[PDB]
mmCIF file of C-alpha atoms and ligand atoms in Angstrom:
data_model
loop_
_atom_site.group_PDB
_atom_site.id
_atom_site.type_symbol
_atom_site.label_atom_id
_atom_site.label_comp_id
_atom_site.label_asym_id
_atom_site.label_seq_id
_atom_site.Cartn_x
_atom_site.Cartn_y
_atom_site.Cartn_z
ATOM 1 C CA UNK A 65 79.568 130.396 -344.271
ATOM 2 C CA UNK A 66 81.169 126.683 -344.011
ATOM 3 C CA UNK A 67 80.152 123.810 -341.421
ATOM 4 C CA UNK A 68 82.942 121.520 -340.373
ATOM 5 C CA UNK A 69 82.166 117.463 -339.976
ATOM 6 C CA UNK A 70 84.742 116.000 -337.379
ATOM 7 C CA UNK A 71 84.954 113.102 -335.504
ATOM 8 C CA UNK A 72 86.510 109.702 -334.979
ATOM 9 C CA UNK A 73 86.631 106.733 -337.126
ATOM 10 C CA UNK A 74 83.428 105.251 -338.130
ATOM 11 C CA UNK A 75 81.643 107.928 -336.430
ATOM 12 C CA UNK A 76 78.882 108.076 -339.481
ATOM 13 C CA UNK A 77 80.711 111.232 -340.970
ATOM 14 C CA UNK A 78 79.958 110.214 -344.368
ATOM 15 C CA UNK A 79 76.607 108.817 -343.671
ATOM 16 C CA UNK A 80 75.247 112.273 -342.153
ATOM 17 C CA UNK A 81 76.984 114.244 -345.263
ATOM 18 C CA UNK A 82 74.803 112.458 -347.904
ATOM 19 C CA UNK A 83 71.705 111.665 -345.481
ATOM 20 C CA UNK A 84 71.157 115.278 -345.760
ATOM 21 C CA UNK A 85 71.712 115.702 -349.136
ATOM 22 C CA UNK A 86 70.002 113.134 -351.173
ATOM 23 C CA UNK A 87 68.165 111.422 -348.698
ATOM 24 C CA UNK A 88 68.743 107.595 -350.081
ATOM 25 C CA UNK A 89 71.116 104.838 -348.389
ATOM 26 C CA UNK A 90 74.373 104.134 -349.749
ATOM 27 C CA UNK A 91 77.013 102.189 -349.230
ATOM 28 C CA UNK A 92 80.368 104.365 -347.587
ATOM 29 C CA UNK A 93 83.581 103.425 -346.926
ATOM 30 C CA UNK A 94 86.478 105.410 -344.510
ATOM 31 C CA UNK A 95 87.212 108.774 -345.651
ATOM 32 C CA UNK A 96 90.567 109.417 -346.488
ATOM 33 C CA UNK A 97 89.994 112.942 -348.417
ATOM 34 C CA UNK A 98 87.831 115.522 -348.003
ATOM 35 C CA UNK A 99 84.087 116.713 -349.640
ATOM 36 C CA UNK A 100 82.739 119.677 -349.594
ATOM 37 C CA UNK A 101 79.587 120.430 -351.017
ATOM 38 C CA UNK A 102 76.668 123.450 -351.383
ATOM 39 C CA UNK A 103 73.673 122.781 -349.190
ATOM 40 C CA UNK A 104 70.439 125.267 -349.815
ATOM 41 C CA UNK A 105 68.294 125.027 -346.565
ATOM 42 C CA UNK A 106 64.725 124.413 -346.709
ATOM 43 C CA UNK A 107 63.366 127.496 -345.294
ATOM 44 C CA UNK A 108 61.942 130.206 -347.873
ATOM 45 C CA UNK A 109 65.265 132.336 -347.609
ATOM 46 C CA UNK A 110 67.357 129.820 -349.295
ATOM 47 C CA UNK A 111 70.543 130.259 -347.853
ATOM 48 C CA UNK A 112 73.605 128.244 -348.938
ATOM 49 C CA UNK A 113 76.360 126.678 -347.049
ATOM 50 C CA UNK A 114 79.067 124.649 -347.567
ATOM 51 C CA UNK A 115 79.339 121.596 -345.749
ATOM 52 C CA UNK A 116 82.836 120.285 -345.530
ATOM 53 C CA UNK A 117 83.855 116.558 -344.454
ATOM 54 C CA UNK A 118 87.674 115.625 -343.097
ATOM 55 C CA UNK A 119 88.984 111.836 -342.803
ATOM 56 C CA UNK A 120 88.485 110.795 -339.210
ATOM 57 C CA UNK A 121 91.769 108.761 -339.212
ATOM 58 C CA UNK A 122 93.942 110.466 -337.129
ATOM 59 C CA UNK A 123 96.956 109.894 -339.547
ATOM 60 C CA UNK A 124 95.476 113.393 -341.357
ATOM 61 C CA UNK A 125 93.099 114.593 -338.410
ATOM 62 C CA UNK A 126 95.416 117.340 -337.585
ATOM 63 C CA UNK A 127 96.607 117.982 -341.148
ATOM 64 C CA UNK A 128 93.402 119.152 -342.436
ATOM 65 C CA UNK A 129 91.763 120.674 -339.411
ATOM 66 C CA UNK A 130 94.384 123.305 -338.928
ATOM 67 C CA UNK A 131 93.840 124.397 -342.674
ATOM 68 C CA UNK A 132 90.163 124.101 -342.364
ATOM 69 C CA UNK A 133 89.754 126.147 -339.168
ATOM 70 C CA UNK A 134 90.278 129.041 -341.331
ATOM 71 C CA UNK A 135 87.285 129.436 -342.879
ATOM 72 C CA UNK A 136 85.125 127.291 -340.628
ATOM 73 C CA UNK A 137 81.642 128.627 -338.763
ATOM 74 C CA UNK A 138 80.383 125.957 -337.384
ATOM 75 C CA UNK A 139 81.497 122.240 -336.180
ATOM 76 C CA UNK A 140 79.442 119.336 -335.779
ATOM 77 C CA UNK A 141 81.454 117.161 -333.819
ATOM 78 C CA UNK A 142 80.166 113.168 -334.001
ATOM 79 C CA UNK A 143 80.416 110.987 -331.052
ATOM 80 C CA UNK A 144 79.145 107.422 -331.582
ATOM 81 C CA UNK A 145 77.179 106.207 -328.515
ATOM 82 C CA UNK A 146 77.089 102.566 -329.342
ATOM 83 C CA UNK A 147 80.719 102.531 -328.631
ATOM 84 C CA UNK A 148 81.341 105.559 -326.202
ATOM 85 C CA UNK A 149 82.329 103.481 -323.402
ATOM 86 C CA UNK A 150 85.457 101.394 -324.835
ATOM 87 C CA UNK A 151 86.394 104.507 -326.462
ATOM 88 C CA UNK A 152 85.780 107.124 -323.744
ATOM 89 C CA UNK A 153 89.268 108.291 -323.650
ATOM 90 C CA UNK A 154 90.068 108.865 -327.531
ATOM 91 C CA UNK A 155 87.157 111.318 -328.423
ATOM 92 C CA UNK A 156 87.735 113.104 -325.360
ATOM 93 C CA UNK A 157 91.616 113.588 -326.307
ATOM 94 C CA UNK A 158 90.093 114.931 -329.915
ATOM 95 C CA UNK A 159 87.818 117.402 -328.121
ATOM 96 C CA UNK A 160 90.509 118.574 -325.940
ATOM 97 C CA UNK A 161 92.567 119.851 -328.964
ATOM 98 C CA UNK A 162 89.424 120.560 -330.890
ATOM 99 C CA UNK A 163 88.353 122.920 -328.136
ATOM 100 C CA UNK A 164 91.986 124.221 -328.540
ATOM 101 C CA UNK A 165 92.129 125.110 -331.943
ATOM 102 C CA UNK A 166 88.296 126.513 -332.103
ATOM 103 C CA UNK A 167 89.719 128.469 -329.911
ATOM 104 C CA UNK A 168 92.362 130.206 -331.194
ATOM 105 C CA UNK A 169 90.050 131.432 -333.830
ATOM 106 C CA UNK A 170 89.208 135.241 -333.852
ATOM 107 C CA UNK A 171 85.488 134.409 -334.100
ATOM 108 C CA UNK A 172 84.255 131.989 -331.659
ATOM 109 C CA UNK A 173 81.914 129.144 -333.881
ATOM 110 C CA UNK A 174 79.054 127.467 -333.062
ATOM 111 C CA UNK A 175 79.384 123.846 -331.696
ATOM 112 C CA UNK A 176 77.145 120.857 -332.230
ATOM 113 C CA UNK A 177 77.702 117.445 -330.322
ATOM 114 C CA UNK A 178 75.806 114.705 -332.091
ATOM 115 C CA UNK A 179 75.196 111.719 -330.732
ATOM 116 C CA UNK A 180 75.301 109.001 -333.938
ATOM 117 C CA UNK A 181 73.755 105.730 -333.128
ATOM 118 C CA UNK A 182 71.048 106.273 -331.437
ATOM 119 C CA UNK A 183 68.703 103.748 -332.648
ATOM 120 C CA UNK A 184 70.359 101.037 -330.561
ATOM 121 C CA UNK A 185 69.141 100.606 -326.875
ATOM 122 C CA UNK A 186 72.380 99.965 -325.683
ATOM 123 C CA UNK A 187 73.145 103.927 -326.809
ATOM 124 C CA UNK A 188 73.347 106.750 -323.974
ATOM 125 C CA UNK A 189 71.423 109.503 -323.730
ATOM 126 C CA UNK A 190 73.120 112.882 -324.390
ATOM 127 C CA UNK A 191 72.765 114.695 -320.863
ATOM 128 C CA UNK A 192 74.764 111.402 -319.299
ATOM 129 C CA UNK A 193 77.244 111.657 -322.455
ATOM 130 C CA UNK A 194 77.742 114.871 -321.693
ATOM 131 C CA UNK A 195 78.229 114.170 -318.071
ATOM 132 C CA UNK A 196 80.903 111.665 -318.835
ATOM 133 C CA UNK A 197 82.498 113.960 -321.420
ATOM 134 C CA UNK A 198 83.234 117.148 -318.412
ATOM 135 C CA UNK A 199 84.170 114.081 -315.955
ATOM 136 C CA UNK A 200 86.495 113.143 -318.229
ATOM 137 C CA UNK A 201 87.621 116.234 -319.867
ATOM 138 C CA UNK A 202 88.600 117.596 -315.904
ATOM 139 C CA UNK A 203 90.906 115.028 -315.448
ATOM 140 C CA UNK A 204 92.451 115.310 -318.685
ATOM 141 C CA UNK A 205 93.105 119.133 -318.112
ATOM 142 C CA UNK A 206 94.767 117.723 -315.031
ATOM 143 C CA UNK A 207 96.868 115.163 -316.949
ATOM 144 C CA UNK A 229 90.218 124.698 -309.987
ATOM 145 C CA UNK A 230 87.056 123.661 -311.283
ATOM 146 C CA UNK A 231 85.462 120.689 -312.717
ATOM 147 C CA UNK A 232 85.026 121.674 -316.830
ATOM 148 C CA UNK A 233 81.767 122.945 -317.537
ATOM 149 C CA UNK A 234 80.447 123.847 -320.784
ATOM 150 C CA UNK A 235 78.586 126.388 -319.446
ATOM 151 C CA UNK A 236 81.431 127.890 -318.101
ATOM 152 C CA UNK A 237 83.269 127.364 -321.496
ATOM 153 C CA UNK A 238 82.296 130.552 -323.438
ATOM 154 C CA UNK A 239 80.847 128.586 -326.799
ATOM 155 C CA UNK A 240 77.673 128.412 -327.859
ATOM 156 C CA UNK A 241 77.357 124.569 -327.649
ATOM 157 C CA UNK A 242 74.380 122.133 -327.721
ATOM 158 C CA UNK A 243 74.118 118.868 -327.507
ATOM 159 C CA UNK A 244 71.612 116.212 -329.243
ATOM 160 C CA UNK A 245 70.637 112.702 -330.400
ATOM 161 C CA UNK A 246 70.665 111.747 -334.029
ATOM 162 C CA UNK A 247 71.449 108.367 -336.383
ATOM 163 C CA UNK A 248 72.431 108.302 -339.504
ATOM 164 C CA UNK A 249 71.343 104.469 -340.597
ATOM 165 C CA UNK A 250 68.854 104.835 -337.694
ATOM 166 C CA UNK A 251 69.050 100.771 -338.229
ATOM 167 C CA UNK A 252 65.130 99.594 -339.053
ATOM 168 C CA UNK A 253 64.061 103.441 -339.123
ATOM 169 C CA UNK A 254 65.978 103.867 -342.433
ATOM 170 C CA UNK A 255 62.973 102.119 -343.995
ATOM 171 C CA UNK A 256 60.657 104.492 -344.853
ATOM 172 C CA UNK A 257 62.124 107.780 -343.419
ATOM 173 C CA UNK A 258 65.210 109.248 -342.364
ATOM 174 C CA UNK A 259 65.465 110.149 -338.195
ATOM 175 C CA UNK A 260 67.035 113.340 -338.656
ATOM 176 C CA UNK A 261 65.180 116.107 -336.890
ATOM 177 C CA UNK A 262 66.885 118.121 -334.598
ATOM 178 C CA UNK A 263 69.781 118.925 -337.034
ATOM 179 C CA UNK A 264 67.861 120.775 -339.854
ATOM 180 C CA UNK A 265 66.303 122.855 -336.777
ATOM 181 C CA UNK A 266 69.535 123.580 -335.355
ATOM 182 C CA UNK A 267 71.126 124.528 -338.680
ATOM 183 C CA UNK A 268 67.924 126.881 -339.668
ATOM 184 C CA UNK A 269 68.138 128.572 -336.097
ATOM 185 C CA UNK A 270 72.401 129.116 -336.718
ATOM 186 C CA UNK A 271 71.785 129.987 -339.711
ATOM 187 C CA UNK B 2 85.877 86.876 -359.237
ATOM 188 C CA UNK B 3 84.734 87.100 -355.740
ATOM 189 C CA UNK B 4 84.772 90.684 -354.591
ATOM 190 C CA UNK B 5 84.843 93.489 -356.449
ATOM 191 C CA UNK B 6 84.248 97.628 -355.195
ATOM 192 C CA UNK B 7 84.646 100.966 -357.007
ATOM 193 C CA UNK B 8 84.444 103.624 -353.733
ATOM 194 C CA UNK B 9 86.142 107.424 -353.936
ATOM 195 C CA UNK B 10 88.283 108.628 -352.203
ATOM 196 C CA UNK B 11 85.421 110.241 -350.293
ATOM 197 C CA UNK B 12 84.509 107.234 -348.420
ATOM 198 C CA UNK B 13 81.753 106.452 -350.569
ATOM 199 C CA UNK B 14 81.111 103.241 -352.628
ATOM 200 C CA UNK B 15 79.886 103.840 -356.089
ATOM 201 C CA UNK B 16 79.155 100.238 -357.531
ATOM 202 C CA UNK B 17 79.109 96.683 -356.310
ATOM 203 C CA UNK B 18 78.010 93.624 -356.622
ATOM 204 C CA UNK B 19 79.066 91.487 -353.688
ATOM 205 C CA UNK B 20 75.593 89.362 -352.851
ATOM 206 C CA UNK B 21 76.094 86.892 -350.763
ATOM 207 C CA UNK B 22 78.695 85.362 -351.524
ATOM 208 C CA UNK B 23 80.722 88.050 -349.774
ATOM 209 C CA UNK B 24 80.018 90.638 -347.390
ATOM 210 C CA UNK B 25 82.088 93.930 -347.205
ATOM 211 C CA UNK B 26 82.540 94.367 -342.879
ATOM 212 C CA UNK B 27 86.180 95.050 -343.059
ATOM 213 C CA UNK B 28 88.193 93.835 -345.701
ATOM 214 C CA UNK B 29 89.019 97.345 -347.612
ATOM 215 C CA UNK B 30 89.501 98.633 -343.753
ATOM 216 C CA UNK B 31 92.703 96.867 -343.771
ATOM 217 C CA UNK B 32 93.430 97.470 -347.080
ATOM 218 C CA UNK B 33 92.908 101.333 -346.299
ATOM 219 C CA UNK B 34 95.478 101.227 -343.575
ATOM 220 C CA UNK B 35 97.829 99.857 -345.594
ATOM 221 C CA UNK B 36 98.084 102.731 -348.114
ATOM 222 C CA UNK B 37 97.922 105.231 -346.075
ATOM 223 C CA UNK B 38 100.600 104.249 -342.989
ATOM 224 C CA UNK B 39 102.511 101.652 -344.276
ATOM 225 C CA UNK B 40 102.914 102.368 -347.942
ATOM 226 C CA UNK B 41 102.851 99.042 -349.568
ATOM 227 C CA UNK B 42 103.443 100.079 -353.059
ATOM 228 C CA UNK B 43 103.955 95.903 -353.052
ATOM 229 C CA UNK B 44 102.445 95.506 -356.704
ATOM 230 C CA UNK B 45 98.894 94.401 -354.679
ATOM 231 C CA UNK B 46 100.025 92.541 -352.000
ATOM 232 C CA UNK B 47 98.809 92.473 -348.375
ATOM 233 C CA UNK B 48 96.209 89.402 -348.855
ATOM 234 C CA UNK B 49 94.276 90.443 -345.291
ATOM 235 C CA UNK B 50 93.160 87.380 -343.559
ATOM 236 C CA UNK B 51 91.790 85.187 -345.911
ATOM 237 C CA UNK B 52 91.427 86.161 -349.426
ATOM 238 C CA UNK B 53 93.707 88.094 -351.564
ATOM 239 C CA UNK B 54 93.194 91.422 -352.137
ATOM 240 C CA UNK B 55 94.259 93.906 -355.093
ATOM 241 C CA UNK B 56 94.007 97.506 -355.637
ATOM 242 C CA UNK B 57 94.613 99.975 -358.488
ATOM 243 C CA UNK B 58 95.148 104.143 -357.819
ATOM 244 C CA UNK B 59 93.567 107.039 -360.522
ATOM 245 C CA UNK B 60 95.018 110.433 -359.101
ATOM 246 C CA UNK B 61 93.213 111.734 -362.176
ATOM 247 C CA UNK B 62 89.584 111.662 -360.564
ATOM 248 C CA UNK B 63 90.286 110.809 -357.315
ATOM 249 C CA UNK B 64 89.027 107.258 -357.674
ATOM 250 C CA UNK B 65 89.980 103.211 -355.982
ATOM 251 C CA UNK B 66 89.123 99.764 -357.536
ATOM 252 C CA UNK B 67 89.567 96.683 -355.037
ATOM 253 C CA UNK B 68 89.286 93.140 -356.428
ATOM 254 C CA UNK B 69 89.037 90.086 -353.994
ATOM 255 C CA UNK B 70 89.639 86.837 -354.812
ATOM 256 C CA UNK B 71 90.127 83.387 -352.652
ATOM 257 C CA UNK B 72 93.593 82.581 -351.221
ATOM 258 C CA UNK B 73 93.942 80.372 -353.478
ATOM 259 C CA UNK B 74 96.086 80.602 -356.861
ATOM 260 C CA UNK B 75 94.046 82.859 -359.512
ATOM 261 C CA UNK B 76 95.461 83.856 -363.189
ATOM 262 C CA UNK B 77 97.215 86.993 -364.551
ATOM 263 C CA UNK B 78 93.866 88.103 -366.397
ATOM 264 C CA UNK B 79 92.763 90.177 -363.417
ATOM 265 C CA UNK B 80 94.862 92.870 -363.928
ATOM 266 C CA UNK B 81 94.150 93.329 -367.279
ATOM 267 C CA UNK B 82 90.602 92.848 -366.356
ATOM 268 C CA UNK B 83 90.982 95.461 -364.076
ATOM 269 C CA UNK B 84 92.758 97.932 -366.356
ATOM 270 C CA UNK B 85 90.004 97.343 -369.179
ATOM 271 C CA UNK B 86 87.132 98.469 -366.554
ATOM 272 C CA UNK B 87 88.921 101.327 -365.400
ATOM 273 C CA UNK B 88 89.312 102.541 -369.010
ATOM 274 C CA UNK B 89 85.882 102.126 -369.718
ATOM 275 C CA UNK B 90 84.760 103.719 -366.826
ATOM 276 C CA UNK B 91 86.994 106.906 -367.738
ATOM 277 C CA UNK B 92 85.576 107.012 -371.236
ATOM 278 C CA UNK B 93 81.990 106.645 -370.266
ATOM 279 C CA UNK B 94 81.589 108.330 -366.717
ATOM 280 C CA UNK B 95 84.009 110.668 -367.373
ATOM 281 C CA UNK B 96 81.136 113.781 -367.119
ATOM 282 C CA UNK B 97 80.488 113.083 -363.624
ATOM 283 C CA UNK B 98 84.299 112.128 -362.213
ATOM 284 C CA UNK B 99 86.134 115.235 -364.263
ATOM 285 C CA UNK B 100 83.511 117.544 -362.002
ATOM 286 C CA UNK B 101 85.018 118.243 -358.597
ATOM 287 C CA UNK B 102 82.185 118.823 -356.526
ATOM 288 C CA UNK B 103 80.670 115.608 -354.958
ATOM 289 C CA UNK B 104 76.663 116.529 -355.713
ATOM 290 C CA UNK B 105 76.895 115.600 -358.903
ATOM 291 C CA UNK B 106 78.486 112.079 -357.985
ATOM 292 C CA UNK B 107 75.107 111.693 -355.452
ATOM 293 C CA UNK B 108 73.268 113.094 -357.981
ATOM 294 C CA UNK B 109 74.443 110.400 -360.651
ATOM 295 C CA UNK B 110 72.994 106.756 -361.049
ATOM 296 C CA UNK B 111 75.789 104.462 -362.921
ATOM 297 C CA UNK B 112 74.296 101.060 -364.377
ATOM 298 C CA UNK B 113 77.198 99.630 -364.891
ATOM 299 C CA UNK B 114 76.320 96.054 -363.769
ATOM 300 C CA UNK B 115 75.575 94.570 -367.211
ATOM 301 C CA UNK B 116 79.091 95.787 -368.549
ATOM 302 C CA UNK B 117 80.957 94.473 -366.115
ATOM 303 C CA UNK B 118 79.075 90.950 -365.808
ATOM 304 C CA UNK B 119 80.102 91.079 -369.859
ATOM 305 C CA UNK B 120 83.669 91.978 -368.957
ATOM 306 C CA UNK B 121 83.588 89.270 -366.591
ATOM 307 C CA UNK B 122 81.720 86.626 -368.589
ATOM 308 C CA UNK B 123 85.111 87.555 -371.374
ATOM 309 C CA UNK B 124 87.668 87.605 -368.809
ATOM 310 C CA UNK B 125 86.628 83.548 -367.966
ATOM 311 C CA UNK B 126 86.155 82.232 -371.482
ATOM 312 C CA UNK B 127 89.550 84.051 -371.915
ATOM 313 C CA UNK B 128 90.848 81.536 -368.516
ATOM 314 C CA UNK B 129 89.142 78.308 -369.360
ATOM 315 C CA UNK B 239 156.851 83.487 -367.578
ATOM 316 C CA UNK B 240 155.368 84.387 -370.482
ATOM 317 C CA UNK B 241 155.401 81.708 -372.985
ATOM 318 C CA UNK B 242 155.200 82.910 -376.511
ATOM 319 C CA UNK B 243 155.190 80.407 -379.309
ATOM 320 C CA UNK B 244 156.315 81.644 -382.796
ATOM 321 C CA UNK B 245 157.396 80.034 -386.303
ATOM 322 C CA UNK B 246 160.583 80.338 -388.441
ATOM 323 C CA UNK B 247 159.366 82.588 -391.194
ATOM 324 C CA UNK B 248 158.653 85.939 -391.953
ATOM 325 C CA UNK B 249 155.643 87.986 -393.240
ATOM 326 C CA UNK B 250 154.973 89.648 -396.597
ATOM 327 C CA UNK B 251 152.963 92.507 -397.545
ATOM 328 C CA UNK B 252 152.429 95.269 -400.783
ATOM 329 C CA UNK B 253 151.733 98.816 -400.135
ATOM 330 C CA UNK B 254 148.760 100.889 -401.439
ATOM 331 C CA UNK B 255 149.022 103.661 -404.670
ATOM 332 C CA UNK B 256 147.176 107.318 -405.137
ATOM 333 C CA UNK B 257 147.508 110.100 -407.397
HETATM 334 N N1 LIG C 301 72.539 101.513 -337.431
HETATM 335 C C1 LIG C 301 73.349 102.547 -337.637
HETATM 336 N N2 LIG C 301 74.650 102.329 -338.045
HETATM 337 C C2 LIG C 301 75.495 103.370 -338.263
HETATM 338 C C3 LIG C 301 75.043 104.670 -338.069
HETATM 339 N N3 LIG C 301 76.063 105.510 -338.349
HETATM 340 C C4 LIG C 301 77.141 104.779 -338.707
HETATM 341 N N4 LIG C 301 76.808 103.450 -338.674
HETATM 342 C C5 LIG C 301 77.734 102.341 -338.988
HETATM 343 O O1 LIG C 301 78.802 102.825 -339.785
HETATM 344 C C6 LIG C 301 79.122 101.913 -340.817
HETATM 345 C C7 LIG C 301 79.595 102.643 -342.072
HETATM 346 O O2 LIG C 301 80.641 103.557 -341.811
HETATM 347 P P1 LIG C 301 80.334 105.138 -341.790
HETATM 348 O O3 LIG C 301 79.072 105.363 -340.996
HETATM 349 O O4 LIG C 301 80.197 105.671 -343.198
HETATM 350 O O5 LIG C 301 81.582 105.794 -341.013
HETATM 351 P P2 LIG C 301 82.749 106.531 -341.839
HETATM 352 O O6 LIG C 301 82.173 107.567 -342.767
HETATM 353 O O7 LIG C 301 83.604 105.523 -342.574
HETATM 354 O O8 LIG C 301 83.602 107.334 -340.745
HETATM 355 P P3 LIG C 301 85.154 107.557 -341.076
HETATM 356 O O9 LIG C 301 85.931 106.284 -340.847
HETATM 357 O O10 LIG C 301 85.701 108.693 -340.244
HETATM 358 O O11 LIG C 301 85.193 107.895 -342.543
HETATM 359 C C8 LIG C 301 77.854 101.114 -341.071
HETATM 360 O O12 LIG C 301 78.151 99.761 -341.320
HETATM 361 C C9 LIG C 301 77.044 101.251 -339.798
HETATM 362 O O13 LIG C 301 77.041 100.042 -339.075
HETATM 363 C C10 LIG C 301 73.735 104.900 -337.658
HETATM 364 O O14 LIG C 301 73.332 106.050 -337.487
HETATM 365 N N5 LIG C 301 72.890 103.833 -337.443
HETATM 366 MG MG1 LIG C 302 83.671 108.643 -343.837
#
């Protein structure tokens, strides 16, 4: 039915809404509302979804995600990997309650963890993000197991993607991985 | 003028014109912030770092217009300037703004460059013991007559 956009402030929340939309660059700024819009998939069925995108400030993080979770099923959660590692400890405090809240649904969604930014080298690559997300995600439980996500009953994946894609923006968009997983949730 | 952006509330930027001579890394960022947590409702104050910076609200579609100018002192005619493009973009653009749904915004192309540099090229022609004295007398009056 609906697919959620979350994540933390210039995360490229806006950028992947349009990107898959209209496929030409423009120029965002932070979100403070939300957009939803009808998406028809590219496969011969057809199918439309609504994709819905909340502010990432975290003035209104919590104010819209517990009246969006109603309706909601699937999240894409966006974790920037340029900047992961002087902001280890914020996304992972937004998963914990995301986790939370998904939850507490009565139908368990499906869960995407994209990796924005990964046209610069200095980005990580998803199994060693993910790594560093159940290292840190134990000790935040804390503050008998360490967390797994296999262990965690969701149907969670994780994979690379860019929005800007920096020089690759040129002539194409690199956005791959997301259409497939969409068609194959869908 | 120096800097001047029309973005939604979306977090998308419609129209600008910037160039070089200013580039937009973070000076609506701060301006952001200040709306939303501390409420400035200052009548466009909150000059950032190092250029002042005004804003203007439309509930009605959902819609922002930031100005930037230098620090320095800068006349009256840019609010006026900014009320005039704000009307015109209501009575023009209103098909696309009055619809809800954001495809049609991403869908839409505005050329609106030409009409502002106009606006703009107006705008700076426009710029270049009680004591109670009394007498010894007394008064005299008549008296008024009816039927
Ligand atoms: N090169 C590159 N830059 C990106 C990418 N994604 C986001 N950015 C950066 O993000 C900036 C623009 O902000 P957005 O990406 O729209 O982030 P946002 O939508 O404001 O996120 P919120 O603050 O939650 O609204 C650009 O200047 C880029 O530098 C990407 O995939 N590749
Ligand atoms: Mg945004």
């Amino acid at each position: 039915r609906a697919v959620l956009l979350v994540g933390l402030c210039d995360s490229g929340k806006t950028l992947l809404f349009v990107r898959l939309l209209t496929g030409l660059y423009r120029d965002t700024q932070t979100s403070i509302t939300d957009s939803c819009a009808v998406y028809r998939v590219n496969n011969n069925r057809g199918n439309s979804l609504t994709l819905i995108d909340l502010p990432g400030h975290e003035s209104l993080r919590l104010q819209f995600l517990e009246r969006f979770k109603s309706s909601a099923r699937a999240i894409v959660f966006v974790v920037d990997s340029a900047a992961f590692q002087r902001e280890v400890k914020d996304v992972a405090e937004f998963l914990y309650q995301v986790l939370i809240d998904s939850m507490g649904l009565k139908n368990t969604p499906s869960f995407l963890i994209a990796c924005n930014k990964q046209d610069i080298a200095m980005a990580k690559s998803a199994k060693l993000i993910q790594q560093q997300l159940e290292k840190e995600l134990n000790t935040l439980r804390v503050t008998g197991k360490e967390f797994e996500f296999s262990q965690l009953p969701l149907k969670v994946e994780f994979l690379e993607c860019s929005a800007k894609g920096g020089r690759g923006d040129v002539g194409s968009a690199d956005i791959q991985d997301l259409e497939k997983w969409l068609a194959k949730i869908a | 003028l120096d800097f001047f952006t029309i973005f939604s509330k979306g977090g998308l930027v419609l129209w600008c014109f910037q160039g070089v001579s200013d580039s937009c890394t973070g000076p609506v960022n701060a301006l952001i912030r200040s709306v939303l947590l501390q409420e400035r409702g200052g009548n466009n104050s909150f000059t950032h770092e190092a250029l002042t910076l005004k804003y203007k609200l439309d509930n009605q579609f959902e819609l922002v217009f930031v100005v930037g100018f230098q620090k320095i002192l800068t006349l009256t005619y840019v609010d006026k300037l900014i009320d005039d493009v704000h009307r015109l973009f209501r009575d023009k653009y209103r098909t696309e703004i009055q619809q809800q749904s954001a495809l049609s915004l991403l869908n839409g192309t505005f050329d609106f460059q030409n009409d502002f540099l106009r606006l703009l090229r107006e705008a700076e022609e426009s710029s270049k013991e009680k004591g109670k004295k009394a007498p010894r007398v007394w008064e005299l009056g008549g008296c008024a007559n009816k039927e």
